[PDB]
């Protein structure tokens, strides 16, 4: 197995929930301003 080949897949896979999670808070915060 290659750490590099698993590096992109692992980083992208872990990043998916990381980016989506942070984005969720942003979207909600924006909507909270719309009242």
Question: What is the spatial distance between Cα 33 and Cα 29, in angstroms, rounded to a whole number?
Answer: 7
Nearest 10 degrees: CA dihedral of 8, 11, 13, 16?
-120
Question: What is the spatial distance between Cα 35 and Cα 18, in angstroms, rounded to a whole number?
Answer: 27
Helices (H), ranges, the chain: 3-34
First to last CA, the chain: 52
Angle among Cα 5, 21, 28 to the nearest 5 degrees reads: 155
| DSSP assignment letter at 31 | H
Question: What is the spatial distance between Cα 18 and Cα 21, in angstroms, rounded to a whole number?
Answer: 5
Question: What is the spatial distance between Cα 10 and Cα 24, in angstroms, rounded to a whole number?
Answer: 22
User: Please, which experimental method was used?
Assistant: NMR
Structure tokens at 15: 């990043």
């Amino acid at each position: 197995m290659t750490f590099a080949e698993l590096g992109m897949a692992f980083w992208h896979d872990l990043a998916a929930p990381v980016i989506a999670g942070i984005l969720a808070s942003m979207i909600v915060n924006w909507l909270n301003k719309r009242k």
